[PDB]
């Protein structure tokens, strides 16, 4: 910024760019050198991409050169932490967490079933043998 007769004062990085918003020349009026003024300008003028508070669900934004990075809390993913992990309870996602068979259900939660000779336990996802030799098991290893 340049007030009345303020330009009469010599250059001051603090007063003009820190304490105030300085233009490019004002800045060039401090460092003098172009290569130097550029190195400084590149960041000083980049703009805090976090200003829009892009990160969601308790995320934490970290500004970058014309970009940002979001650090989400455990239960969230996505460029902006916009993804709820606890809402991926479908069969395509890790077999819906079922030990054997998985069955999607529009709206409600998914169901888990078992193969013959097996029974679905109370946990709703596990299957235990109901016969002495259920398919898929190797006796000398069980």
């Amino acid at each position: 910024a340049n007030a009345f007769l303020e330009e009469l004062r010599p250059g001051s990085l603090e007063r003009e760019c820190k304490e105030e918003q300085c233009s490019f020349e004002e800045a060039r009026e401090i460092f003098k050198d172009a290569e130097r003024t550029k190195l400084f300008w590149i960041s000083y003028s980049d703009g805090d991409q976090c200003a829009s508070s892009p990160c969601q669900n308790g995320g934490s934004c970290k500004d970058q050169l014309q970009s940002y990075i979001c650090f989400c809390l455990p239960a969230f993913e996505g460029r902006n932490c916009e993804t709820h992990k606890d809402d991926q309870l479908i069969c395509v996602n890790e077999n819906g967490g079922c030990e054997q068979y998985c069955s999607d259900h529009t709206g409600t939660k998914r169901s888990c079933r078992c193969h013959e000779g097996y029974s679905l336990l109370a946990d709703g996802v596990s299957c235990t043998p109901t016969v002495e030799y259920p398919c898929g098991k190797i006796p000398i290893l069980e």
Partner: protein
């Protein structure tokens, strides 16, 4: 339905996002000998955050494919080993103390998306001796440099005279993306 194309990895400080064209899909990510894990189920976005899957072992090399829906139509992304490709964010000068003729310039140990216990590891924690910082300081018309195995610089300054600084994270061993962009400029 057209198979997706131009798959690219966008990774900085391990925050890895796979982007693609053109502008409903499902992405799977795996390691050369691991099972395939579906991510971003039926998204209409041409991107998918895979950060959580790759931070489980940064040293690993991952491969990802994008299935297209109106065996399905897909495309494979380039191989991607985080630890050797993720980009180093823009460093930042945390502080600088002067004791007579010498000045101590510090670089902030920025945090990474890589989790351990209940906290985000810092750039140091993950790379250690692999990461060094380069100082580019000046008064005089010329420039001077300095390098450090840690996150601090200890240089000799001409008493009185004013200086400016600018660091830059570097991982020397790296074949690609071994240098991060320059930090903002700071002057005494």
């Amino acid at each position: 339905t057209v198979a997706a194309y131009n798959l690219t990895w966008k990774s900085t400080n391990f925050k890895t996002i796979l982007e693609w064209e053109p502008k409903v899909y499902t992405v799977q990510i795996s390691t050369k000998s691991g099972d395939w894990k579906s991510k971003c189920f039926y998204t209409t976005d041409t991107e998918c955050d895979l950060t959580d899957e790759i931070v489980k072992d940064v040293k690993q090399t991952y491969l990802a494919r994008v299935f297209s829906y109106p065996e399905p139509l897909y495309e494979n992304s380039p191989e991607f080993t985080p630890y050797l490709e993720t980009n180093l964010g823009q460093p930042t000068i945390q502080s600088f103390e002067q004791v007579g003729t010498k000045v101590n310039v510090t670089v902030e140990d920025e945090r990474t998306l890589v989790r351990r216990n209940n906290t985000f590891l810092s750039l140091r924690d993950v790379f250690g001796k692999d990461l060094i910082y380069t100082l580019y300081y000046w008064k005089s018309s010329g420039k001077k440099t300095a390098k450090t195995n840690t996150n601090e610089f200890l240089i000799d300054v001409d008493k009185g005279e004013n200086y400016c600084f600018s660091v830059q994270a570097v991982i020397p061993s790296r074949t690609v993306n071994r240098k991060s962009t320059d930090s903002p400029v700071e002057c005494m």
